[model samples]
Target: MRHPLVMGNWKLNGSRHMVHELVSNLRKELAGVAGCAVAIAPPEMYIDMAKREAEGSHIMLGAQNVDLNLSGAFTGETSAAMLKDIGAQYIIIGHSERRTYHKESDELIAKKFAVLKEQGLTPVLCIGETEAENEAGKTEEVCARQIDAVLKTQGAAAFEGAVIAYEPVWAIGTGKSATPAQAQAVHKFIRDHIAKVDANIAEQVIIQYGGSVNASNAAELFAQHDVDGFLVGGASLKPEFVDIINAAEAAKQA
Candidate 1:
């Protein structure tokens, strides 16, 4: 079975104290929640603290971003090796904010995926189209380009343990979310793309949907075949994250 996974991206928010508090609260709430995996990505500075706080809890810790390089003189950058040493098992790459604000390109993001894979860290590779692209009916083409760029650089084998998050740029942080049908359509497109390259890898990869994913809408979204789980943003900061995690329970019982 493909177990659902929920991950919180703290983004550029949260301080050391806030991270500790969030970790403690999440660990306590998620202690016995089974049949699903939960993880949180804090800013790089708090990765170790999050890891330490979640040490014996059901919650897994992750980093918001990491340097593609294993090591060397990359000042102001955290390498995959450093992240591993600090106990982070997963990392987010190519987030919309990173791509838009930092101007990260597909080639650079692909290189990061390669480095993360080389160091045994799972890259939650994010890909999606902007609102304009969706309006122009280019969602599929844009998503394909993102995936193809990575595949061209790292090959199909790199997808074995990776996670793919489809977060439409315009919906993210705008309080706007894709409807269940809309999300399912794009997710199916992504899985189909992967299947064309390698079926085994496609089956094993966990494809998640992001952008205003909250408790109210999580159930319907999780019920979609191609959507394995979520990469939650604003909702993850609230107590509702627990509800989002348990959304699948109702579906299973039904």
Candidate 2:
């Protein structure tokens, strides 16, 4: 059986005060709730402090982004090695905002994926379709392209301990989430696509549904067979995120 993972992508958010408060509170609230694996990816700057605040808890610390270069003159870029050194266990790669705002390409993202794995850090690869792509019935096509970029470069085996977050661009931060059915269909497609190359890897990989996930919708989304958990965005910074974490725990029982 696959364990559920509820990952929080804090994005361009978090101050030291917030990090300490949020992480410490979550650690207290989440005590003894062990059915699902929980991770929080605060802004890169807060990872160190967050890690300390999450001490003695089940919460895993993650990063919102990572640079492919391990060590170089790539000014202002945090390399995979540096992130690992700072106690970041999971790194977010290919997030839609990076693709749209920074103009990051699939090839570059795939390289980042390889680098993170090389450093023994889990890469949370975000893949999804835009509103227009969905309107034209190209959701699966878009997801396939994003995923194949890594598969072709890093090989299928690179996915052994990685996480895939399906965050449809149209739904992200827009407050509109895919119905549980819509999320499940794409999640199933992702798993089946991986299964074609290696059944073991496919079964072991964690697929999280991202895009405006909140306490209200979290359980339904988690209930879907293929949706192991979520990559929460805005909600991750709020107290209700505790409820969402509880939702994943509840789904595990179901």
Candidate 3:
């Protein structure tokens, strides 16, 4: 069975002081949490600082994005190799915000996923659907398109050591979250789809729920067999992230 992974994606929020305080606080709070894995993906500027602060703890460091090229004249880009050098273990690719704001296509996100794999960094590929898409009943279609963009190119084997975050775009940070059953159904769909490619990888792949995953909803979500854990956003910046982490641990116990 895959261990639960409770990761915090700080997104475009954080300051030097916040990183120092939060990383240290989390380290202290999460000391005895052995049943589940925990990681924090701060903004790029604080990755080094957070890495330094989390050195002696169970906490792992992740980054929000990376460049496709290892080394280049790209004025404002960081490469997968560079992220690895900085001690980042995970890299989030195709977050809905990235897809919407930066206009990242599924094809480009697939390249990023491949880049992370090549550098031995875990890629947390984010796939989701907008409100309109959901209303149109195209959630699975959108997710499949996004996921197939990589599986078709990299094969099911490429996912052996990676993660897939099923974040419904409409639910993210909107004070709304998918019901436990709602998230579970989508997660099962994702896993079953992967099973069609390779059963072994499907069973092993960690599929996390994202979008407004606060402490209150985390336990019920984690209780779902397909809901391995979470990729948290807003709640990650608060003390309740500890509660969410504990929730995953409790689910494992159950």
Candidate 4:
């Protein structure tokens, strides 16, 4: 069975002090929880902070991004190996912020995914539609292409140990989230698309819903059948993060 995963992507947000307090609190908040997985994705610079604070706790460490290369002249790039060495088990890839702001293409994201797998790290591949794309009735088409790129580059098996996040680009940080129904529809679409390639793998892969997930709305959103968990953003920075984590654990038996 897929474990419900509520991961926090603290993209470029966090200070050493903040990391200490947050992870410290989270370790106690989720202690002995059995049905769900909890991971904190701090910026690369703050991964060590997360590790130190979360040491000896159930809280899993994650990185916001990683490089495809193990070692190279990529001066600013952090490798999958380094992430592994530091005890990170998950690395986020192909997020809308990266795709849109950094112009990361699908090919690059695919290679990033493969690299993480090779190093025993799970990659959370994010797929979504722009507001215009949604209005143009291209939501499925857009998401299909994103998934197809990975299938073409790494084949269906690439998703065997990975996770996917369906985030509507327009909803992120916009305060407008996809209703549970809307999120469920897209999540079913993503999983069904994978099912076409391999039913067994489809059944195995964990799909999470992202985009403006908050303390108040998390329970309702996570209650959906296809919403195994959430890729939380803004609300993750606050103490109420405990709410999101508890909500996800509550829905783990769903």
Candidate 5:
């Protein structure tokens, strides 16, 4: 079975001081956590600090984004190689915020995936639909389009060692999360999409649900078959994150 993996995405949030404090607190809380893998993706500036602070703890370090190019003249872009050298084990790609704010195309995000894979860093590829798309019943189509754009160029095998976060654009930071059934429906679709190209990869890769995930709802969401864990947002910045990490512990006993 795949191990449960939980990642806290501190997007555009936290500073050097804030990260030190958050990491210190998280380290203390994650002690003795068993049967799960924990990681935190802070802003690019905090990646180095986070890696150092998480040392000797269950928590691992990750970054929110990285440039597709290997290096040089990108004018304020962080590259996958740089992130790897900084001890970042994972990087988020194609987050809804990026797609919306920066107008990142699927093709461009796919190139970013290629770069991360080449440099030996895992890409936490995020895909989901907007409220408009969801209401118009285009959720599955939108997700498939995004996934296909990547797979078409890189092939499904690229996902063999990566993580995918199914975070609906409408749900992120909106204090509204997808129901267990709603999350499972999309997760299952994503897995089936992979199975079509490579069953082995489909079974091994981690697929997480993100969008306002918190301690109160963590257990129910993580209980789903295809929902391996979460790509947490807001709650990640607080002490309650420890509670979210231990939700599975509570589930195991009950």
Candidate 6:
């Protein structure tokens, strides 16, 4: 069975002070975490701070994004190799915010996905649908398109050490996270779809729900068999993220 992974994505939200405080507090909370894994993707600037602060603790470190090229004069871009050398174990790719704000296509995101894996960094590929797409009942179709983008280039084996985060565009940070059934159905769809390529990889890889996950709803959501964990946003900056992490541990215990 796959161990639950509770990861926080601190996208464009952090200060030096906040970074030290959050990581220090999380270290205290992490001592009791069992049967689940925990990671946080901090802003690029704080990766070193987190690397220093989270040392000698169970809290794994991750990066929010990476450049596809191994290394280049790409102004203001971090690379997968650099991230790995600096102690980042995972990198988030194709986040909805990136696709929307930066206008990244699925193909470009797939390139990033493949490169991260090549450098031995686990890429957490974010796949999701907008409200219009979900309302039009194209959720699965839209998700399949995104997944196919990577599968075409990387094949099923590239996913062996990776993760997939399912966050509906409409629900992300908008206070409209999907209900448990709604989230679970999509997670199952993602897992089953990947199972077509390799059931073993599909079963072992973690699938997390994003978009406004919090302590209040953590248990119910994580209780679903397909709901492996979370890719938290705003709530990750607060103390209740400990509760959410604990909730995944409890959900795993159950």
What TM-score do all the candidates reach, one by one? 0.96, 0.98, 0.98, 0.97, 0.96, 0.97
Write candidate 2's Cα lDDT for 132-198 as tens digits.
9999999999998899998766778999999999999999999999999999999999998888888
Model 3 lDDT vs. the true structure? 0.92
The models' CA-based lDDT, in order, is: 0.86, 0.91, 0.92, 0.88, 0.87, 0.89
Off by over 4 Å in 2: none
Clashes of 4: 0
The predictions' CA RMSDs to the true structure, in order, are 1.3, 1.0, 0.8, 1.1, 1.5, 1.0
Across residues 152-200, which tens digit of lDDT does each residue of candidate 4 receive?
Answer: 6788898998999898999999999999999999989988999998988
Candidate closer to the true structure by TM-score (higher is better), 2 or 3? 3
Model 5 CA deviation exceeding 4 Å by range? 249-254
lDDT of 6: 0.89
lDDT tens digits by residue: candidate 6, 160-244: 9889999999989998899999999999998888899999888887899998899999888987879988999989999999999
When sorted by lDDT, best at the front, the candidate numbers are 3, 2, 6, 4, 5, 1
Collision count for each candidate, in order: 0, 0, 0, 0, 0, 0
Weakest 10 consecutive residues, lDDT, candidate 6?
67-76
Clashing pairs in 4: none
lDDT of 4 at 238: 84
Comparison by lDDT, 2 against 3, better one: 3
Q: Between the candidate structures 3 and 6, which one is better when assessed by lDDT? A: 3
Worst 10 residues of 1 by lDDT: 245-254
Q: Candidate 5 — number of clashing residue pairs?
A: 0
Query: What does the lDDT read for residue 68 in candidate 6?
Result: 74
The clash number for model 2 is 0
